[PDB]
């Protein structure tokens, strides 16, 4: 029997200040947060319909810098898919993406972990990471790339829905 909607555990990772929380709060509350309040760890839930299937998204919003290693390993083991977020005006956040991805692959002991590359703050004028560079990186990993703005809401739904589609593909192989 059906016992309730399918649940997906999604984790949002990336460097300090790239907009992890702003993306999530835009999804959950349709609200843009202008303030920068560094996260420790926050948990959100949302019911949505993606490709005709109702599902419950359990979303973990993480700290940019994870001081304490055992807590970080736990959410990497529990997460089924990961949004790897950088900011298109912060080159260093883009270079850090490779490190997040390697850490997740190591902890899950798998080459094929559902992931989406997210280039956030695409509303800002001071772009230092080119779209083409980000697409190349994502193509090298075999994952989708999406440009977002937590401010304008561009790509916000798409980033999360695309990640659910990646998790579904991985569960049906
Ligand atoms: N213009 C613009 N600013 C953004 C965007 N996304 C986030 N911001 C801003 O960037 C700052 C940090 O965003 P926040 O969500 O707190 O980042 P975080 O990645 O969760 N930081 P931490 O890792 O410490 O929790 C905030 O001032 C926020 O308004 C965006 O898409 N466009
Ligand atoms: C415990 O279940 C949850 N687990 C996670 C979660 C997702 C991915 C990785 C993780 C996670 O958790 C810790 C370890 O690693 C997120 C939300 C809830 N749950 C949740 C969140 C918010 C509400 C809304 N409620 C506060 C009003 C309800 C359920
Ligand atoms: Mg945050």
Residue numbers in the entry: -3 to 169
Could you share sentences copied from the article?
Here, we employ the intracellular antibody to identify a compound from a chemical fragment library that binds to RAS proteins adjacent to the effector binding region. High-resolution crystal structures show the binding of this compound to mutant RAS, and this structural information facilitates hit to lead development. Our structure-based approach has produced compounds that bind to mutant KRAS with sub-μM affinity that interfere with RAS-effector PPI and endogenous RAS-dependent signalling in human cancer cells, and show a correlation between in vitro binding and potency in the cells. Although, various RAS inhibitors have been described in literature,24–32,47,48, in this paper we describe an approach for the development of RAS-effector inhibitors by combining different elements i.e. (i) the hit identification via a method of intracellular antibody fragment competition; (ii) structure-based design via crystal structures (KRASQ61HGPPNHP) and NMR (waterLOGSY and CPMG); (iii) identification of clear structure-activity relationship (SAR) for the development of potent compounds against KRAS and (iv) the proof of concept in mechanistic and phenotypic cell assays.
The new analogue, Abd-7, gave improved crystallography results with full electron density for the compound and with van der Waals contacts to K5, L6, V7, S39, Y40, R41, D54, I55, L56, G70, Y71, T74 and G75. Abd-7 was found in five out of six protein chains. The initial fragment compound (Abd-2) was improved by introducing pyridine functionalities to position 8 of the benzene ring from the benzodioxane moiety, enhancing the Kd from μM to nM with increased ligand efficiency values from 0.26 of Abd-2 to 0.34 of Abd-7. Abd-2 has no effect on the BRET signal over a range of 5–20 μM, while Abd-7 reduces the BRET signal at 5, 10 and 20 μM for all of the RAS-effector PPIs tested. The binding of the CRAF, RALGDS and PI3K effectors to RAS is similar and very close to the binding site of Abd-7. In Fig. 6, RAS with bound Abd-7 is superimposed to structures of RAS-effector complexes showing that the terminal tertiary ammonium group, and adjacent phenyl ring, of Abd-7 overlaps with the bound effector structures. The competition effect of Abd-7 on the binding of the effectors with RAS in cells, can therefore be interpreted as steric hindrance of the lower affinity effectors by the higher affinity Abd-7.
